[PDB]
Amino acid sequence: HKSEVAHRFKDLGEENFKALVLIAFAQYLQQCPFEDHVKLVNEVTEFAKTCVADESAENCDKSLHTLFGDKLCTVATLRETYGEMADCCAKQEPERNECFLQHKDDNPNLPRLVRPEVDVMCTAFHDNEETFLKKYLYEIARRHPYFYAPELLFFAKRYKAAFTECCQAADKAACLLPKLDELRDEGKASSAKQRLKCASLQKFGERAFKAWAVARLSQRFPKAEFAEVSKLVTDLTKVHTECCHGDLLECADDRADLAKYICENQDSISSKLKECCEKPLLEKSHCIAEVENDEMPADLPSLAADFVESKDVCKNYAEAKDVFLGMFLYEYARRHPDYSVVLLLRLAKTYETTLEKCCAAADPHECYAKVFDEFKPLVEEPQNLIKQNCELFEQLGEYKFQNALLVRYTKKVPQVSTPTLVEVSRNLGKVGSKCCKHPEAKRMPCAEDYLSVVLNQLCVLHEKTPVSDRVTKCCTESLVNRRPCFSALEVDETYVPKEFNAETFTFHADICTLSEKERQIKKQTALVELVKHKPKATKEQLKAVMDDFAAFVEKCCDKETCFAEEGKKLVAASQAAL
Numbered sequence: 166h167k168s169e170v171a172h173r174f175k176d177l178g179e180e181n182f183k184a185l186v187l188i189a190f191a192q193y194l195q196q197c198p199f200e201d202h203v204k205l206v207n208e209v210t211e212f213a214k215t216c217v218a219d220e221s222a223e224n225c226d227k228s229l230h231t232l233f234g235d236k237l238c239t240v241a242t243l244r245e246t247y248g249e250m251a252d253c254c255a256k257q258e259p260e261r262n263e264c265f266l267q268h269k270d271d272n273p274n275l276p277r278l279v280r281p282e283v284d285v286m287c288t289a290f291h292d293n294e295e296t297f298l299k300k301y302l303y304e305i306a307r308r309h310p311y312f313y314a315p316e317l318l319f320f321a322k323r324y325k326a327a328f329t330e331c332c333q334a335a336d337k338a339a340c341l342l343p344k345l346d347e348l349r350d351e352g353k354a355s356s357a358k359q360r361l362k363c364a365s366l367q368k369f370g371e372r373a374f375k376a377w378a379v380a381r382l383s384q385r386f387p388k389a390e391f392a393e394v395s396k397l398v399t400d401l402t403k404v405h406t407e408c409c410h411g412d413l414l415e416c417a418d419d420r421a422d423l424a425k426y427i428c429e430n431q432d433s434i435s436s437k438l439k440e441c442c443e444k445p446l447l448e449k450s451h452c453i454a455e456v457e458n459d460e461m462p463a464d465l466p467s468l469a470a471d472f473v474e475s476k477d478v479c480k481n482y483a484e485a486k487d488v489f490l491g492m493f494l495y496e497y498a499r500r501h502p503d504y505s506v507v508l509l510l511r512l513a514k515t516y517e518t519t520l521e522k523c524c525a526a527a528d529p530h531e532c533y534a535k536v537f538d539e540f541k542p543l544v545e546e547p548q549n550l551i552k553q554n555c556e557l558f559e560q561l562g563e564y565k566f567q568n569a570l571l572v573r574y575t576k577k578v579p580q581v582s583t584p585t586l587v588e589v590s591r592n593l594g595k596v597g598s599k600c601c602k603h604p605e606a607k608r609m610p611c612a613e614d615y616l617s618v619v620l621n622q623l624c625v626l627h628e629k630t631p632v633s634d635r636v637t638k639c640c641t642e643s644l645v646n647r648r649p650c651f652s653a654l655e656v657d658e659t660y661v662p663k664e665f666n667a668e669t670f671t672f673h674a675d676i677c678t679l680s681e682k683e684r685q686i687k688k689q690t691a692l693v694e695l696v697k698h699k700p701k702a703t704k705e706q707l708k709a710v711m712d713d714f715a716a717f718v719e720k721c722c723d724k725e726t727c728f729a730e731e732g733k734k735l736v737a738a739s740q741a742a743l
């Protein structure tokens with residue numbers, strides 16, 4: 166604790182230290198060029214080495230916030246590039262870093278990163294691996310200034326492994342592109358869950374987050390006592406509360422302390438934490454958050470004894486309601502790791518609603534005597550949706566499943582723009598193929614995680630340009646009722662059909678020369694416009710048009726004159742049967 170930067174350097178190692186220092190500066194000086202950040206990192210790294218050689222060297226006793234802030238305020242172009250951020254450099258350190266944190270631009274006006282060609286990437290990866298990888302780590306950090314820097318380093322090493330493996334293969338793009346796409350989607354999803362959880366914390370209070378934490382931790386750690394789960398929920402709530410604040414050092418120390426406690430109490434938490442409590446301090450907390458569920462105890466009794474049958478239900482509930490409800494959620498969650506967290510919260514709220522009415526009634530024991538019967542329809546509702554949607558997914562393929570969702574959701578809310586209907590239907594289709602490859606024991610948790618990012622992304626684009634009231638209603642609802650609200654959407658019978666546009670249903674020779682993905686998006690776009698023009702069209706009528714369209718595209722591939730002549734016949738023949 167004498168020299169804090171030296172302790173960081175020796176715990177993290179030189180390689181990880183430089184990467185984290187690059188990420189940290191890129192998240193505050195988002196508008197500075199890459200070569201300026203490399204200059205700061207090398208200067209900070211050479212300074213850290215003097216503290217490692219002599220803890221008593223000058224300025225080595227200063228705190229990390231003081232050293233970081235002081236270094237940040239030496240940037241010559243600070244005031245010219247960052248207007249009122251330079252005014253932070255006139256405040257004491259307790260208030261200076263707070264001032265710096267208030268100017269982290271969430272969505273800066275930076276151009277979209279372009280994925281270069283595969284050959285130019287592998288060539289650059291070979292010619293200068295260090296600057297190639299670090300430039301892109303810089304480009305991502307400056308675009309996600311609130312993304313937890315060690316997790317950004319965790320993905321960065323996955324990018325390095327992808328280039329190392331696939332730049333030596335016979336077909337580079339054969340395995341590099343699928344890995345890069347998988348990394349892109351996974352990174353954008355992780356960055357979405359983090360920002361979404363932080364927004365939910367402030368909008369629905371700390372109590373709603375603790376309930377979620379009790380459910381999740383009991384599924385992961387079913388063998389731990391309730392007191393151990395409740396203690397972890399309190400610490401996890403403090404970790405997520407301060408990590409949402411944005412301070413990197415305070416967030417990292419909280420996560421390190423929790424992982425340090427969990428690894429010292431493995432015998433009272435889980436038996437699955439063995440492999441990752443041996444990992445270095447940089448990776449411990451990250452892995453524990455992704456550890457698989459431990460096995461639940463063998464013969465666990467029914468919940469009716471403590472929560473329905475025996476007396477003192479209202480008495481034990483009235484003494485401390487959230488504790489009693491927390492025990493119910495703990496006992497229910499750890500017996501059902503196959504449930505989604507939100508489903509467990511629906512049952513807790515249902516049990517809560519019952520006690521608040523029953524404990525004030527004439528005969529309370531008679532009142533809640535069958536509270537478990539109310540849980541059956543709530544449990545069976547998502548279980549039937551998974552079976553129904555993936556018996557349909559098994560009848561079709563992924564692309565044909567997306568077309569079914571596309572027709573179904575366009576009918577329900579025709580007011581949503583076509584690009585949003587296309588994008589969400591394709592993503593919701595990816596949830597089908599991603600999760601129904603799993604067995605029944607882990608289908609609902611899979612769907613919950615993937616639906617929550619698609620449904621929030623749906624309203625992230627919808628909140629900016631609101632069109633449909635029924636979509637905003639489902640996203641103003643709590644995260645527990647969000648998915649059932651969207652499932653409860655009915656076909657809009659008050660929607661007048663869209664005016665026919667000839668240029669919309671016009672097709673040129675570009676579709677045959679476009680890529681497979683670009684051809685699908687173009688075909689799926691016209692399918693939305695077909696449903697918006699004729700919502701009352703039936704399944705067999707739409708299939709006839711889709712079959713004729715596929716035959717129209719295949720027959721026309723002369724090619725230019727076919728799309729115009731055969732296209733005029735397709736449009737007219739469809740207008741006679743719709």
Ligand SMILES: O=C1CCc2ccc(OCCCCN3CCN(c4cccc(Cl)c4Cl)CC3)cc2N1
Pocket residue numbers: 277278279280281286301305309312317320321345348349351352353356
């Ligand atoms: O040289 C390369 C190779 C890799 C690559 C892929 C896509 C690409 O262009 C797409 C446009 C920007 C997409 N980014 C991808 C990374 N992504 C993200 C967000 C949070 C965490 C994490 Cl870990 C991540 Cl990855 C943000 C959005 C360019 C490149 N450039």
Ligand SMILES: CCCCCCCCCCCCCC(=O)O
Pocket residue numbers: 372373374375376377379395487488490491492494510513514517643645
């Ligand atoms: C140990 C106390 C943990 C927190 C108390 C659990 C209460 C569960 C009630 C469930 C209803 C609220 C769910 C929500 O708002 O998201």
Ligand SMILES: CCCCCCCCCCCCCC(=O)O
Pocket residue numbers: 381382385401404420423424450451453454455
């Ligand atoms: C993924 C939620 C936790 C993110 C904060 C990192 C804390 C890591 C140690 C706590 C592990 C909690 C396990 C869990 O996610 O249920």
Ligand SMILES: CCCCCCCCCCCCCC(=O)O
Pocket residue numbers: 568670688689691692695710711712714715735736739740
């Ligand atoms: C007015 C009707 C004009 C023709 C409408 C074109 C509809 C195109 C839908 C394409 C979806 C199926 C694609 C395929 O079968 O591969």
